[model samples]
Target: SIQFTDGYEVKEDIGVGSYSVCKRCIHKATNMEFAVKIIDKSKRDPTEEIEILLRYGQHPNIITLKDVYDDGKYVYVVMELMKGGELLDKILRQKFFSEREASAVLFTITKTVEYLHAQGVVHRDLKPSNILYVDESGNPESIRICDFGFAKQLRAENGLLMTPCYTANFVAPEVLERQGYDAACDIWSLGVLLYTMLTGYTPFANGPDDTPEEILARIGSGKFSLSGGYWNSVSDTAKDLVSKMLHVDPHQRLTAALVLRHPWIVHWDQLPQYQLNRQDAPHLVKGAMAATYSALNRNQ
Candidate 1:
């Protein structure tokens, strides 16, 4: 028998990287299917405690880590299998991208946010890629949130996490501060997500070869618009909500609870259903969720 393959049978490769191969795997005893990524120790890094995962995974919309095995060099990360795939694909592949549909999507995310913030958990990174459907059963209720790679919970010393965690320039200005950030950071990201979902493009963009400083400056500025063709027919109420969440000052940003009660999300059904998809809808979707996370464990 194989060294660590005693109990589980590894299946086809789902993803491949320089130092890793992500595969579908299954446990023989329980026959539970899982998407496992076997990563080589040569390339990587972390330090979030599992208590966060164990606690929050209980939510119907969150993903759970089933088991992990480390054989000195390689690490096996067994993630709960989500069959329905990325939310971007689900939303964009449709004929009519309606405001009501968009609201229903955001409603689940907001409700989950409301739940998490109340529990002192902040999903520092909330982008479309992290949002996946629980299965192939086509329904909004199937939309489950995944990837807690950058999630944080309340610490005894302070209400916020202090580790410098970010992916490229997908950071909130406050996340760059020594004072750190709380659930407000999540709201800011949600703002960006909402903007992009509605418009099929990110609020922030940079030159082809923009420097890190330049990108950071743009994000720090927090200046974006729902202008032109996109917003022509959309209600002003939706724009109001977008403006509230994407505010430059975290103090001015809408809290998830407040957002839950916002008129746009509250009166989603009242909005019209129309063709929100642009010519390059799928391409824009691919660009929509380029956001990611890495909890900086810098100490070299």
Candidate 2:
């Protein structure tokens, strides 16, 4: 039950929740630094996450989980330590947002999703937080997907996923509305990512009162504006891709394979250099992200 105590020199807690806390640790046996997510077995089940990590960690864009320790009350899962910060935070802090950069980010994400979908796995929570940089240098291509807490593998005979699980900001209209969602949820999430990259704020529910239920209502319509001055600065092909990804009908949304083949992703160099002319994106995103996260606990 106490095997983890001798195995690693645990450091400061980098993240926490009711059921788990992730901390930096050095495996004493191997003398290597890693992030260890310590979960209370009584409060949370990490079996699915651990399985997914083991299955797909070999992928370049997916963070690798190194080892696992189990005890009566705790489970310690060791994983890669990413120091470069989150995708949204990096985009927010950068001086200017360029379509070229946005398309590049989309390309990596789309390809990763393609692999996941082809493997019959669904990353139900594909938010910016789960997408992160692996090195301190912060290259967009260096981005890696982590935190498979909500991930699930599906080989159900009918091929339809019924879980109502998802993060609010990246939730697809179908999933939030709970009408038999599928892997296309990730595509909707990708659309939201592309939209936010170009404009700085989430497409739906930018207002202050965006609790989960409130945000769900907004996502239900699947309608968002690309019509303002920001849209004028963005490229036509970019807008076209967003419209297809954000389509209300999940079937209409581009699959990861199709997204990878889209002209915008295939010919990202042709993307215009639209400078996102605003600084309020961080403020708006932080508020919405924090709000939904808080309400997530209450509503869940």
Candidate 3:
């Protein structure tokens, strides 16, 4: 039996992050389960992440914030408990996930990003680890976006951002180049994620024992290719959508709205369900702690 000031009882630790610990909690009176994220004030303030959640939490594909508690020493955020776990885990476990399923997942992600863009919020970290499922349904439509620690609001003046913040594997070229970027940066990450979901590997991951500088050089060069035999079964339209999203120039990259309108996504229901081949592929682990990675590399 555990207790907090509120009527909620902390049951067990669900997750651990750099500045916060997520625990499974239950309301004493109602007996309803929830996830409570407790952030340490000594490490960092979660004002921005909480504010963004308050603003955009209503979306179906975005995590819902139930309540907040500030106890001076710590901040407790009560949110919807995502029992289905990480999106990457689901993908890896599935023996025959298909392009149609991937399209459906991307559609939800694009819609979530579209809503965020409309509200002038940019989720800088849009990788697989940040995506979660609401329940153990194994349905693509159950996906939800989480972790807004790196999210930023676009300025009224031209919507330009200068923060050198991003994970190496999913970063846009403009971000790596230290040039001002915008919501399109998220689209670039979306492309990388979509590519990985379809092919079971990152388009620009560092080779084994490669230095940070080497990984940065490959990402900055924007020379990734999808010509491997692994992509043989992927649709041409899907490849085209990825090419548009991964454009080196942010100006030329597909926007979330454009991605929603793309034929591959629009006709997702009609697209043939081409099974993904993961028998020979190793389990992928990129952007697991992307926010920390970005923070560590902000000045590097």
Candidate 4:
């Protein structure tokens, strides 16, 4: 009863991404509000798309794909609507999240990643923008890991293919040098994400003026140098968590589950300021409502 076949009325453009446009529509028969992702069939295999939903859709921490349709023109994926929440958008808009706040976000994300790995799937892109939230009452705690375009079904061995940002910093050292990589690469990406969440900036960035070589050298060094606001406010335990997660050697890096169980994450209650004061800030709630989170464009 959640969908209709008579071509629902497209009320408005809800969101747009690199390969798809999502429309807010009213199902004629059921009268339910749904987000219709209109994607060109030629861009990706329709079966693969369905397979992703079938395998990972059941996960509570991940976005749910409700239904799908093929009309010979575009593949329509009907998805449950998330009122308003974008991980990267909030991170950038709020300047940065505190250790406590970042821990909560990472905790949810680590669970999702762990579940995906358990199901033999790898979220190739585990960045902030792909993380989303659903406001409950007034507090926003529940999160959904979304955007499966880069998700890969982990079989035995498939060549690595992903964007530069998530791939470069998060890729295992074995894969960074273009050696064969696998699910472990996801752990590396998780580390990079943790680094950004805690520090508000990437650890692999070279000096403001350094070139690619300098950046690579910095990354290879496996040492993170903190400065400015990040150095003054963050605690040793917070930095310890980052170091363990971002270990250059994949085998040495803390696994996603371990990161979730880490002292910092488990003791998040000790750090209260990290909890977002949504009730105190009406403007942020309003802004979250008006804007859609998109990975390709941060300005939006």
Candidate 5:
């Protein structure tokens, strides 16, 4: 049996990553439930995650880290419990999901990304899987960003980062170019995410089983469009925002702050409710994730 610190008991494993397993836990005295990430020290060091959480985890949309314990072999990290599930899962399950709803969700994500950028942190990985809900009630504002495995603190010198760290579908063009990039890389990912959320498929994923080279070529070309039947009913404002964010040149990309102020996000409530046909959306998302995993493994 696995034992944790006093006042906390592990209930069940909720999630698993490369170096850690997230388990649901409850406080014995307060009965308050929380998620505890149990990490295997032998697999990887968690110093960066701990540091980022402690430094910039106070934002409303960012997952909060409550406590941490290192038992030499494993590390236990206590955090807020997110019961509503992944954003993509929720969107797929909805019967009447629309562009307005996606705007509200993007608003929350942009706010959190704005906070992270202001704090000099860049979340290199910003795919659907990392977006979670605070409760099972399905409130858009309850969206919380998690998984800081690839997050990096920007240096003060030039605020430039060179690491090729990102998921395949959401990775920015600058990252693929191997040139140093700044916080704008996150904006590029936001573009991809917004595109996927609005269309139910990735803009760079050219085929059902696209090769890494093929996907990279599409991304590098920056020639995606909003001409499909899936995007026919989506508003022009939304497509305009996506175009600005998905710009191939990082310097030409819109920042998080700009995205938050964009008309699509700012006037989300006034936008028409364009119903999405998500019959094949979930499958598309699943395929994108699988491709991302395969690409990451190949890079490693």
Candidate 6:
């Protein structure tokens, strides 16, 4: 059992949960800053949880677990301090992401998922709050994938498993119907992620009263439909990427590597902001021409 002592100064409560509370703290030993997650071991298996996180400490993209200590009744795990940036929830604060920004954000997340899968970890919770970015400068480009509390290790033979709500829309048809699945399930989640980012809301809405069947129906048939005004403003390449990722059939959907190579993700620099007056095909051409010109001008 471990206990939190008064030796270190507590900055603030950075996070809270049913099982634990995370506080921003200064290390009395190294004079370093850390987010200390304090848990009462007596109430649960804190030791096992800490060990699971520690096993994943090596990956750069994965949040780093610095150290763990225990007093008598509570266990404390210190992790690298991330100045929390814009959360996925922040998207609700905006009308919606511009095509360029949405594509870029998706690129980052997909790459993160790619890395996670490579490490044999499945982030069961793949929503916006779990996604964090560092944008103090206001340009807001870089994104860091965080919060692995629900991450599970998958053996090669096991098919699929995940939390319900966060994964509902992103689940493959087979997975939704309780069929077998594997890493590819994350791709479905990524599709929903991209869709939500572009549209500023999810495709399915249960309103706290809808049945699972209704939710699944909304997800299955939910078109990435937008008003003429909205569609006219989004880039064709961005739409293409979203469409491929959100394919209903998992086999038909784009894999992470394939996604990274898609014209939209690969040629992100070529895409531009939406133009209302231009037709889809013509706007795409205009964007390509603008990127070409910008590149040419930069060299001269």
TM-score of each: 0.77, 0.85, 0.83, 0.71, 0.84, 0.68
Give Cα distance to truth, residue 100, candidate 3, Å.
Answer: 0.9
Q: How many Å off is the CA of 121 in candidate 1?
A: 1.5
C-alpha lDDT of residue 171 in model 5: 42
Which candidate tops TM-score? 2
Poorly placed runs, candidate 5 (over 4 Å): 1-3, 156-182, 206-208, 277-280, 293-297
Consecutive 10-residue window with the lowest summed lDDT within model 3: 161-170
TM-score of 5: 0.84
Specify the poorest-scoring 10-residue window by lDDT in model 6.
275-284
Tens digits of per-residue lDDT for model 2, 1-300: 458768889999888877888999998988888899998888878888888899889888899988889876788998998888788778877767677888888888888988887765788778777888888666665789988887876533344433334333343454344333547877887887788777777777575567778776667777878768667777788888999998988877788888888899889878777566544567678677666444434655
What lDDT is reached at residue 163 by model 6?
38
Full-model lDDT for every candidate: 0.69, 0.77, 0.75, 0.62, 0.77, 0.59
* Per-residue C-alpha lDDT of model 5 across residues 111-161, encoded as one tens digit per residue: 888877776578877777788999876776688899887787644234343
* Candidate 1, lDDT over the whole model: 0.69
Choose 2 or 3, whichever is better by TM-score: 2
Clash count (model 2, backbone only): 0
**Candidate 1 weakest lDDT stretch, 10 residues:** 291-300
If both were scored by lDDT, which would come out higher, candidate 2 or candidate 3? 2
Residue by residue across 143-249, what tens digits does model 1's lDDT show?
77766656776443333443333223334444344123557778877886677667666566422343444445666777766677776766788888998988888
Alpha carbon RMSD to native, model 1: 6.5
lDDT value, residue 74 of candidate 3: 90
User: Which model is ahead, 4 or 6, in terms of lDDT?
Assistant: 4
Least well predicted 10-residue stretch by lDDT in candidate 2: 161-170
Candidate 3: misplaced stretches above 4 Å?
Answer: 1-4, 155-180, 206-210, 279-282, 286-300
